[PDB]
From TrEMBL, chains A, B, C:
Binding positions (Cu(2+) 12): 87, 232-233
Top-level taxon in the UniProt lineage: Bacteria
Protein's recorded name: Copper-containing nitrite reductase
Residues binding Cu(2+) 21, per UniProt: 254
Source organism phylogeny: Bacteria, Bacillati, Bacillota, Bacilli, Bacillales
Positions of Cu(2+) 2 binding: 23
Length: 299, 299, 299
């Protein structure tokens, strides 16, 4: 634990977003050091955006230019932001912001989909593994062909956790935990961090007969994901959330590290449905969420 | 070795299946403890369906409802069944059957493809790793567009084996063996277990010039598979065996854990053709099968 | 270090190719033992084709029959060649050539794409891991639908390096290095070996606004690749380089071991753009290349 991080636990700060034109959006995040309970009794003093790991959800429209400000609250470590959604010059636009400073960077989100974002400061592995990852969704101008069939939707993110700030482990060791989190799209949706237990104890909710859409991304840092919902089959899958990349009837979706998808499936009966990576060593180490399906859709 | 499993070696029992209506099929399996030779001189006292690991092949038609009975012969461990093919309530329909009891569960197979099945009892990793995995094929109502080109077909399954019933190894260790097995579709086809040697010593057979279809699934538990046939290219691939997910001219097919495919390729010359996962550490640890191609198609 | 390899460092020999008919091409390679600097201060006495690892690039046209000669310069180890592009009998056409001998083998390249080649001598893992891997590109007769949009193109290959000639490490250990190399398509293109530094210090070059095509293959031996270019999104992707396998708007391309692709992306701003596998443990261990984009396209 970096001497200047000892005892530091910066309270989470809300994401700030506001539209400033028909095709322009302001976003303001922080980089901050925040204690997160990743397993019961296990605190990780994470490197975060806004005190969440993964960070807060960003949603924009295809064709929006993002005017992004990062306020670095870390007392000693520089941080930066890399959005996979955007076309940008990495050496000009994804550059470091020093402690106690801010930086603003502008770039377009030209492509629909479910994109990873993460800090881009060398060593990138260190910043991602310590918690500086997240998702930005870019909504397609023309929608998805199955939009009218979807009854309910959520966002799920997979990540790993390693021994604390240990570059040897990050490079060469198996993950200690692999976890899901959910980030809110609409008021009332849960908003959680990557931990082994919250989405088991407080399942996502749905109603019998519904078609559910999940926007998913496996942020890694290191593992691929074999994404599967127990008790159903994916009716439709759009790789990276691009409407053109359309598969049907998949049992399990292969996600690379940073890989995204939009997946849709029908829940036909009441009960609790596990959501896993089917790499079962990772599932055993935390990567199981639950979907509770009731006759009403409320608990 | 669980005290009540010491010395236990339950003889394999045939799968029971019978059609009971134009869209309804009965299946009866066992859960049982059976010694399997996974490498020469290496016995694994596997947790199995029907004394095979992977378990027996199930084939049904798209739109069939399955009335599935599990007879648990294990003297002490509960077991259950999860079919990836079906729409079901996991907490009602994939529940545990206690030792010396049976349970019956009914659910539809609405989607064509090559699906994993496995025990769903917590910890799922333990039940899969110990051998409780298999494949169910759901035949598409409308076939595949290349059906008329296929001359011969087989089923191949990839799995791993770890240190015996060792949850630490299952979670954190590399596999000791990675293996292929073949499960019979028609009388005379081989029916083998996941071992390092049988499909090398007794290759699958084909005839010069034939187009071969393989129904494949990588059941894991933990690894992905880079499926490749030496000396050919896949003419056509259907991801998860759904006819819509149609690729052409692939050298190697990426399978997630639990991932399936229908793959088709032409063998143009006499000889022996290795079949591998191209993750060559896994191939070296057992995952090489052989296809012997002769002028007649018989040995 | 095999006693007969001690002190051996065979100078690289150029690939020999010549067209001998409208649909027939001669290729002559060597198998040879050559010291390669894989990281600064770290020499690997590689098993190679032609003194390069990965080996030299081969480019042919769809429908060409290849008349391939391997001249084995290794004083003691037999070697062979397996081209993923071709239809061949592995047990007749991919056979070993003994030390100080040559062998010639003929087979057709019927399928367009970006194919791995490698030695096929048992244990195959040993020959691949020690450096005997490479790429053959088969150009599609009808092109790719986006050909007219591409301004500049390069070839990139990903491989791993392990502890020297250590079969235990090859089977059971994490890679010590994961690396990119580039192989020349046109005069003036760089031609490099798999190392941790050359494509950082001497980036690939491009011009602002260009659409870039990369022909890529992950030769392994053991890992999958999460291929990503920072600061852009792939406009179009053709899996295995087959024009039919067409995805759009992908952030990251999942490559199995031996998996290939043609990927295309636009660079909109001047700067330096990292090229990674997004499995960041591998990126940290060497697998980052750089693309320098200038107003002119020259350094
Ligand atoms: O039903 N999924 O194992
Ligand atoms: O089907 N999830 O084990
Ligand atoms: O020819 N497959 O290495
Ligand atoms: O092409 N199998 O090494
Ligand atoms: O912008 N790629 O992290
Ligand atoms: O987006 N490369 O970290
Ligand atoms: Cu407008
Ligand atoms: Cu602004
Ligand atoms: Cu950071
Ligand atoms: Cu990234
Ligand atoms: Cu509905
Ligand atoms: Cu009917
Ligand atoms: Cu019945
Ligand atoms: Cu079991
Ligand atoms: Cu499952
Ligand atoms: Cu035929
Ligand atoms: Cu001609
Ligand atoms: Cu010739
Ligand atoms: Cu060799
Ligand atoms: Cu190969
Ligand atoms: Cu252009």
């Amino acid at each position: 634990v970096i001497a200047a991080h000892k005892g530091v636990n910066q309270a989470p700060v809300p994401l700030k977003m506001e539209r400033v034109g028909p095709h322009d959006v302001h976003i303001e995040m922080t980089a901050q050091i925040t204690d997160i309970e990743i397993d019961k009794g296990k605190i990780y003093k994470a490197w975060t955006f806004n005190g969440q790991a993964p960070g807060p959800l960003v949603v924009v429209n295809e064709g929006d230019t993002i005017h992004f400000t990062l306020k670095n609250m870390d007392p000693v470590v520089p941080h930066s932001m890399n959005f996979h959604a955007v076309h940008a010059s990495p050496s000009k636009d994804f550059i470091d912001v020093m402690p106690n400073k801010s930086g603003t960077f502008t770039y377009p989100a030209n492509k629909p989909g479910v994109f990873m974002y993460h800090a881009g400061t060398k060593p990138v592995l260190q910043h991602i593994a310590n918690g500086m990852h997240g998702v930005i969704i870019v909504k397609p101008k023309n929608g998805y062909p199955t939009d009218k069939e979807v009854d309910r939707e959520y966002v799920l993110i997979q990540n790993e956790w390693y021994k604390y700030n240990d570059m040897n482990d990050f490079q060469n060791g198996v993950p200690s935990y692999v976890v899901f989190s959910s980030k809110a799209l609409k008021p009332g949706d849960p908003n959680t961090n990557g931990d082994t237990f919250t989405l088991k104890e407080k399942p996502l909710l749905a109603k019998v007969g519904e078609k559910i859409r999940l926007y998913i991304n496996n942020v890694g840092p290191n593992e691929v994901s074999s994404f599967h919902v127990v008790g159903t089959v994916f009716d439709d899958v759009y790789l990276d959330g691009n409407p053109n990349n359309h598969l049907q009837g998949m049992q399990t979706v292969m996600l690379p590290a940073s890989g995204g998808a939009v997946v849709e499936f029908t829940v036909t009966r009441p009960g609790t449905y596990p959501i896993v990576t089917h790499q079962f060593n990772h599932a055993q180490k935390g990567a199981v969420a639950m979907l509770k399906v009731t006759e009403t859709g409320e608990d």
